[PDB]
Amino acid sequence: SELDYYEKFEEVHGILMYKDFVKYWDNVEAFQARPDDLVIATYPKSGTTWVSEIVYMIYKEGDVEKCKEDVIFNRIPFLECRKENLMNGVKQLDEMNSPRIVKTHLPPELLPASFWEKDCKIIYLCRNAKDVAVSFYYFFLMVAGHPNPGSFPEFVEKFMQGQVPYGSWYKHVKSWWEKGKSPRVLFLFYEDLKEDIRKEVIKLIHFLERKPSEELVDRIIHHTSFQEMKNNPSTNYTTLPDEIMNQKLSPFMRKGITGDWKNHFTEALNEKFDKHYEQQMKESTLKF
Amino acid sequence: NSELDYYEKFEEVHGILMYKDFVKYWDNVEAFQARPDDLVIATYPKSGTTWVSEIVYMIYKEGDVEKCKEDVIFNRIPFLECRKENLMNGVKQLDEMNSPRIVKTHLPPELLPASFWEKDCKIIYLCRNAKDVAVSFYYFFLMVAGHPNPGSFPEFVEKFMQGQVPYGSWYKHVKSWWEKGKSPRVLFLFYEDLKEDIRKEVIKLIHFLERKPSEELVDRIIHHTSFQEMKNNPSTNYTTLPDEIMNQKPFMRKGITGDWKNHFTEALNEKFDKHYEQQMKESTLKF
Ligand SMILES: Nc1ncnc2c1ncn2[C@@H]1O[C@H](COP(=O)(O)OS(=O)(=O)O)[C@@H](OP(=O)(O)O)[C@H]1O
Numbered sequence: 001s002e003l004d005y006y007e008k009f010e011e012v013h014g015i016l017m018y019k020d021f022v023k024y025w026d027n028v029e030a031f032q033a034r035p036d037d038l039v040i041a042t043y044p045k046s047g048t049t050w051v052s053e054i055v056y057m058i059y060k061e062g063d064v065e066k067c068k069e070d071v072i073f074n075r076i077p078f079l080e081c082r083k084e085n086l087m088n089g090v091k092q093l094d095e096m097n098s099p100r101i102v103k104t105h106l107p108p109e110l111l112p113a114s115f116w117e118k119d120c121k122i123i124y125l126c127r128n129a130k131d132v133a134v135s136f137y138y139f140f141l142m143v144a145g146h147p148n149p150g151s152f153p154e155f156v157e158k159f160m161q162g163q164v165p166y167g168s169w170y171k172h173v174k175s176w177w178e179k180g181k182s183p184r185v186l187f188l189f190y191e192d193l194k195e196d197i198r199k200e201v202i203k204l205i206h207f208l209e210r211k212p213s214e215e216l217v218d219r220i221i222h223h224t225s226f227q228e229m230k231n232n233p234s235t236n237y238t239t240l241p242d243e244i245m246n247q248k249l250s251p252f253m254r255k256g257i258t259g260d261w262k263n264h265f266t267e268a269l270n271e272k273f274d275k276h277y278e279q280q281m282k283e284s285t286l287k288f
Numbered sequence: 289n290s291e292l293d294y295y296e297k298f299e300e301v302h303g304i305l306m307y308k309d310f311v312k313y314w315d316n317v318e319a320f321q322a323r324p325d326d327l328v329i330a331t332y333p334k335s336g337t338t339w340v341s342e343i344v345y346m347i348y349k350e351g352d353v354e355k356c357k358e359d360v361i362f363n364r365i366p367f368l369e370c371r372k373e374n375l376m377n378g379v380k381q382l383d384e385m386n387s388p389r390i391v392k393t394h395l396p397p398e399l400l401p402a403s404f405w406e407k408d409c410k411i412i413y414l415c416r417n418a419k420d421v422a423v424s425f426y427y428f429f430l431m432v433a434g435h436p437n438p439g440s441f442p443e444f445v446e447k448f449m450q451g452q453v454p455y456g457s458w459y460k461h462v463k464s465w466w467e468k469g470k471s472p473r474v475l476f477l478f479y480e481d482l483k484e485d486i487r488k489e490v491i492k493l494i495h496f497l498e499r500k501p502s503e504e505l506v507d508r509i510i511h512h513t514s515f516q517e518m519k520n521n522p523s524t525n526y527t528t529l530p531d532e533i534m535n536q537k538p539f540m541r542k543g544i545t546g547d548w549k550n551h552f553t554e555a556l557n558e559k560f561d562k563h564y565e566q567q568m569k570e571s572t573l574k575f
């Protein structure tokens with residue numbers, strides 16, 4: 001049902017958003033950033049947790065014992081996220097000592113103005129639309145606060161129209177792509193992390209002005225592999241109660257591959273999606 | 289669990305997987321006595337049997353739609369090997385028929401009763417592309433009693449590629465009938481051809497059956513056998529069968545070519561196409 005679908009959402013500045021977050025939006029827009037804040041921005045399900053753990057490790061010189069001191073969602077606050085009596089992203093950040101690492105799924109136009117004014121470093125991670133759609137679909141089924149996503153074809157329709165939390169994936173990646181032309185905003189691809197993790201890890205170390213030793217690279221590559229992070233309670237979100245995230249249905253660290261869309265899209269839906277994709281993306285220099 | 293289900297529902301006869309009810313009295317099919325003027329309509333399951341059957345029936349009745357409704361199609365055109373104790377019996381239906389008889393079967397050439405070959409009966413074979421057949425066969429499994437749970441479509445398609453479904457390998461079925469189709473008395477047709485140019489195929493069928501073609505006869509056959517008309521015709525849509533046997537909550541599902549695109553994922557299509565080429569590369573048969 002359409003009525004029930006949007007009942008869980010509310011638009012903020014034109015993009016559909018989780019109702020709970022919108023409640024305290026003023027706090028997000030008035031957020032006070034610091035010069036050395038590091039923002040990790042992504043469209044939902046593009047690999048946020050993966051790049052977040054890599055960055056954390058670079059900050060802690062690859063000390064695994066330091067990356068387990070707390071769960072990922074506490075070490076790296078989810079900026080716009082807030083749920084009464086559960087979590088408060090803005091607060092965690094306000095009470096955190098610099099250098100702070102900020103997680104967000106906001107398009108660049110909605111990122112709190114303070115981050116832009118202080119010209120903070122930003123890392124953006126992009127993933128192919130079809131794999132994002134598959135992963136986002138399971139997120140709907142797993143995380144509380146989501147309406148029934150309908151059948152997969154139905155959900156993909158919502159996805160193509162940008163009628164999902166955080167809006168149009170197309171506008172999201174195209175806007176960040178433009179921001180990414182600046183050396184201050186590192187634009188990365190999930191597919192690149194998959195193809196040659198070492199190359200991307202080294203790039204991230206240099207972007208973050210750190211020393212790229214073999215020891216550091218080795219530990220990051222090992223600690224951030226899918227198998228390790230999937231069994232690491234600090235990064236696999238398994239500490240969250242099932243009412244919030246029921247991973248018995250589908251685990252957060254689901255498959256961690258590129259191309260899972262081939263297992264979900266019918267040839268017909270693939271054809272429909274590809275046609276729509278081209279009309280949405282042919283003018284952008286962004287390419288996979 | 290699925291394999292056990294399949295084991296409970298099907299059994300082989302002459303090496304071909306078959307519905308258990310049809311195997312218990314196979315001797316009755318093996319010894320079936322054909323008549324010289326019998327006309328056999330052979331097809332792999334869900335290839336359009338009902339469509340060509342009604343076209344042929346109309347040709348026999350000089351296009352008299354009323355004579356084609358005197359009874360349901362499964363009574364007008366007995367299903368040869370169909371048997372379920374004393375509740376259903378195709379051979380019995382045929383034996384009591386006062387000819388000319390039109391016979392429906394899904395048997396591969398090797399299992400067709402020797403009598404049909406010995407009497408050199410005319411045979412019409414209808415073929416349909418494998419992917420669309422798999423889709424339609426999947427639905428058949430779900431709506432008709434006597435089948436195991438087919439599981440997901442990808443799971444069912446694996447069993448299909450291995451010929452582990454009633455009537456066996458679709459690949460061997462169409463290839464064997466293709467060879468038989470080289471004979472002047474075996475007309476080999478394609479479902480896709482009936483979709484592309486029904487008039488051409490109907491005229492071809494009229495000549496094969498040695499009848500005189502006329503614009504009025506052809507025209508009547510064309511609209512009477514159209515998907516939309518046959519779907520609403522109780523004589524041809526199998527709706528008179530109780531839900532216990534066939535649960536249409538429909539047999540006349542879509543009636544198009546290409547529904548496979550709405551069921552195969554890119555990955556399944558890739559795997560299927562690869563396996564298909566290995567199975568069909570050595571045949572001149574082309575869909
Ligand atoms: N280390 C590593 N290696 C490979 N793949 C990984 C890794 N960490 C996370 N993932 C995959 O990222 C998907 C989850 O995305 P997000 O972290 O962005 O989720 S969220 O938006 O922050 O909730 C999810 O994708 P899917 O498996 O396709 O669903 C995860 O499996």
Ligand SMILES: Nc1ncnc2c1ncn2[C@@H]1O[C@H](COP(=O)(O)OS(=O)(=O)O)[C@@H](OP(=O)(O)O)[C@H]1O
Nearest residue numbers: 333334335336337338339424513514515541542543
């Ligand atoms: N007139 C007409 N026009 C177009 N398509 C038609 C027609 N009559 C039957 N059909 C389609 O044939 C499919 C059923 O196949 P069969 O008749 O062989 O079934 S059975 O094996 O005899 O039970 C089934 O295919 P699907 O729709 O793809 O499932 C029917 O819709």
